[PDB]
Paper text:
Addressing the elusive specificity of cysteine cathepsins, which in contrast to caspases and trypsin-like proteases lack strict specificity determining P1 pocket, calls for innovative approaches. As a working model, [name] was chosen because of the resolution of diffracting crystals (up to 1.3 Å) and crystal packing with accessible active site cleft. Reactive site mutants [name] and C25S of [name] were used in structural studies.
The pattern II group (binding shifted to the non-primed side) consisted of structures of nine protected peptides and one non-protected peptide that all bound uncleaved into the non-primed sites. Electron density maps of the peptides enabled the unambiguous interpretation of residues from P3–P1. The nitrogen of the amide protection group at the peptide C-terminus was bound approximately 3 Å away from the ND of catalytic H164. The amide likely shared a hydrogen bond with the deprotonated His residue. At P4 and beyond, the features of the electron density maps became weaker and less precise; however, it was possible to model the peptides KPKKKTK, RLSAKP, GNYKEAKK, and EVCKKKK up to P8 in the averaged kick Fo-Fc omit maps.
Residue numbers in the entry: 1 to 221
Write the structure that this text describes.
Amino acid sequence: LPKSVDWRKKGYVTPVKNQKQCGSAWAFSATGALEGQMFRKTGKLVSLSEQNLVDCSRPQGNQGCNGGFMARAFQYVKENGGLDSEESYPYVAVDEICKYRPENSVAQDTGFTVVAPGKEKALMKAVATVGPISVAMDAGHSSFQFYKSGIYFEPDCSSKNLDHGVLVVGYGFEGANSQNSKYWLVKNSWGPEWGSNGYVKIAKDKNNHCGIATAASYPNV
Ligand SMILES: [Cl-]
Ligand SMILES: [Cl-]
Ligand SMILES: [Cl-]
Ligand SMILES: [Cl-]
Ligand code: NA
């Protein structure tokens, strides 16, 4: 596999978004993975609608602003036949009436692929060969809230009890040796002001730190 990957440098990733006071990170993680796969298929980068997922995917087991899961969002897009653009179905950060319009759909998927749980090497292969990957993580720490630079490593992090969905856009390493001081490049949904332009470097191959490889998946387009 490549020594490093960064799908932002290839046009696969939209500018950083902000979920605000709504527990919809699972929806931003799912739209980020679908934006990359639609870009790989068509060559067009189009921002997708988190609000469409928040308002319409309760039957699949999501709970809008009270939480949800990326696989359930990809299941909804498959059963639904489509997903509207961010432009046509804007984000308001509260649970609202489902206003899905097929004529405004700009994306589709046939289901999703799961990365084997807990396998950082399996996540590395998916990121190198597919594009950005949806992942769950333990983000419940002040050290994450105030992250700004460096490789994030928190002793209090759990690899099994997770509470936040994010998007792995690549991986890399510090220095000249590609085999040490490794990190995952992660896009968050707390706005560009959070973290480093809305991103964080999370320690890689340090025993599945913060659970990044515990529940990873991507849509099949
Ligand atoms: Cl459940
Ligand atoms: Cl999931
Ligand atoms: Cl840094
Ligand atoms: Cl940057
Ligand atoms: Na920084």
